[PDB]
């Protein structure tokens, strides 16, 4: 499996590691990839796309790297299963509600409720691990 993410201070990156740990604990292999080093072709061969990005300016996906990546794969992911996650600060998850609506709009099947955690996943560590375990069972 593969987890692709963008993180500006390390919050979403930490979530990604924790989600990977859950998948591994369930007996499966998984690689975490920063959006900068992702290979679209190899990524498109995955049965489930696990994508994460923190909330950026005015509740949007990160603009210089993550958004363009989503746009590029947008026409080639109809029917694919996706699990979404990310860290946020002062908002209430608007960027994620929009990210979920967008992926659905591209024809994807959002398999679980998106996992969102405020700032660093300190108290929410187990929640991240459990999300990974749910994904491993799909
Ligand atoms: C430029 C900028 C804009 C932000 N905009 C939002 C926002 O609109 N809503 C929100 O809840 N958090 C916002 N945040 C806070 C981040 O989503 C939050 O700090 C998160 O934990 C960052 O995770 P990361 O280290 O994975 O990037 C913003 C942060 C930055 C740096």
Question: Which domains are present in the chain?
Answer: 1-138 (3.40.50.360)
Going by alpha carbons, the residue nearest to atom 12 of ligand 1 is 89
Give phi and psi for 41, each to the nearest 5: -60, -50
Q: Which atom of ligand 1 is nearest to the CA of 6?
A: 26
Distance CA 84, CA 96 (A): 8
Q: What three-state secondary structure class fits 21?
A: helix
- Determine if ligand 1 sits within 6 Å of the CB of residue 90: yes
Q: Are the C-beta atoms of 22 and 132 separated by less than 8 Å?
A: yes
- How far away, in angstroms, is 54 Cα from ligand 1 center? 6
What b/e readout covers 18-42, taking b as 16+ CB neighbours within 10 angstroms?
bbbbbbbeeeeebebeebeebeeee
Using alpha carbons, list the distances in angstroms from residue 108 to 5, 26, 37, 104, 118.
18, 24, 23, 5, 26
**By what technique were these coordinates determined?**
X-ray
Going by alpha carbons, the residue nearest to atom 19 of ligand 1 is 89
Resolution (A): 1.8
- Determine if ligand 1 sits within 6 Å of the CB of residue 64: no
């Amino acid at each position: 499996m593969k987890i692709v993410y963008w993180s500006g201070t390390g919050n979403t990156e930490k979530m990604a590691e924790l989600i990977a740990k859950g998948i591994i604990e369930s007996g499966k292999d998984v690689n975490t990839i920063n959006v900068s080093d992702v290979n679209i072709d190899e990524l498109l061969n995955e049965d489930i796309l696990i994508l994460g990005c923190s909330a950026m300016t005015d509740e949007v996906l990160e603009e210089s790297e993550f958004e363009p990546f989503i746009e590029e794969i947008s026409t080639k992911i109809s029917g694919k299963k996706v699990a979404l996650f990310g860290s946020y600060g002062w908002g209430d998850g608007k960027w994620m509600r929009d990210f979920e609506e967008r992926m659905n709009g591209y024809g994807c099947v959002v398999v679980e409720t998106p996992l969102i955690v405020q700032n660093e996943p300190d108290e929410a560590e187990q929640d991240c691990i459990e999300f990974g375990k749910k994904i491993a069972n799909i």
